[PDB]
Design a protein around this ligand. Structure first.
Ligand SMILES: COc1ccc2nc(C)c(O[C@@H]3C[C@H]4C(=O)N[C@]5(C(=O)NS(=O)(=O)C6(C)CC6)C[C@H]5/C=C\CCCCC[C@H](NC(=O)OC5CCC5)C(=O)N4C3)nc2c1
Ligand SMILES: [Zn+2]
Length: 195
C-alpha cells in the first residue's frame, strides 16, 4: 500500500513526408525508461504515426482527427507522457482493443477515409508499406503474405487508402504456420463513433 504503472512514451515516428517511408528514433532506451516513470516528455513531436513504448512493450500510435489512437493490449489504461506531465486517456474501449489520447502538439492528423476503397496499405514500425485488400468491416488480406514476425510491434499503426486517408487501426494478425495471411483493424468509422 505505502507502485504506479509508467506512462506510454513516444520514442520515434514513421516518416511518410517524402518519397521514401522510413522510421526515425527520437528517444533511446534510457530516456524512455525515465520518461515513462516521470511522465514528462519535452521532446518535439512530428508526423502522423508515432512509435511508442512502455517499460515492457513497443508498438505504434496514429493521429486521426486530433486523437492519438493505439491498442488497449499495448497501452492498457496508461497515461501518455507529455511536456506538462502524464495525460489521461480520452478514449478507452477494451471491447474494440482501442485507446486514445488528445493528439500531441506538433503532430499531424490523418483524415478519416470516405473513399469506400478496398485497396489499403498497412504501415509498419519498420516503415514497410504493405498492400492489403479489404475483406470486411474489420479485416483485410495481405497481397504478399509474410511471417508474423514482420508485423509484430505494429499494432496501432494505420491502414491507409490510396489517397492517404485513415481507414483503420491495426490490432491483430491472422496466421497459418506463422505466416500472416490477414489482418484485423479498428475501422475509422468505429473511431468516429467513439469520437
Ligand atoms: C488485454 O486486453 C485486451 C483487449 C482486447 C484485445 N483484442 C485482441 C484482438 C488481442 O489480440 C492479441 C494481441 C494482439 C497482437 O499481437 N497485435 C499485433 C501486434 O503487433 N501487437 S504488438 O506486438 O505491437 C504488442 C503485443 C505490444 C502491443 C498486430 C500483431 C502482430 C503479430 C501477431 C503475433 C501473434 C499474435 C496473433 C494474434 N492474433 C489474433 O488474436 O487474431 C484474432 C483477432 C481475430 C482473430 C494477435 O494479433 N494479438 C493477440 N488482445 C486484446 C487484449
Ligand atoms: Zn480515402
Amino acid at each position: 500500500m505505502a507502485k504506479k504503472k509508467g506512462s506510454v512514451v513516444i520514442v520515434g515516428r514513421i516518416n511518410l513526408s517524402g518519397d521514401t517511408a522510413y522510421a526515425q528514433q527520437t528517444r533511446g532506451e534510457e530516456g524512455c525508461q525515465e520518461t515513462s516513470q516521470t511522465g514528462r516528455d519535452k521532446n518535439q513531436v512530428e508526423g502522423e504515426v508515432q512509435i511508442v513504448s512502455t517499460a515492457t512493450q513497443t508498438f505504434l500510435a496514429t493521429s486521426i482527427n486530433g486523437v492519438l489512437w493505439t491498442v488497449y493490449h499495448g497501452a492498457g489504461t496508461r497515461t501518455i507522457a507529455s511536456p506538462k506531465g502524464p495525460v489521461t486517456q480520452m478514449y478507452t474501449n477494451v471491447d474494440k482493443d482501442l485507446v486514445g489520447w488528445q493528439a500531441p502538439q506538433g503532430s499531424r492528423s490523418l483524415t478519416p477515409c470516405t473513399c469506400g476503397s478496398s485497396d489499403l496499405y498497412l504501415v509498419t514500425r519498420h516503415a514497410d508499406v504493405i498492400p492489403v485488400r479489404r475483406r470486411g468491416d474489420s479485416r483485410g488480406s495481405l497481397l504478399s503474405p509474410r511471417p508474423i514476425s514482420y508485423l509484430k510491434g505494429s499494432s496501432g499503426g494505420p491502414l491507409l487508402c490510396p489517397a492517404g486517408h485513415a481507414v483503420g487501426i491495426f490490432r491483430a494478425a491472422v496466421s497459418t504456420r506463422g505466416v500472416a495471411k490477414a489482418v484485423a483493424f479498428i475501422p475509422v468509422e468505429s473511431l468516429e463513433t467513439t469520437s
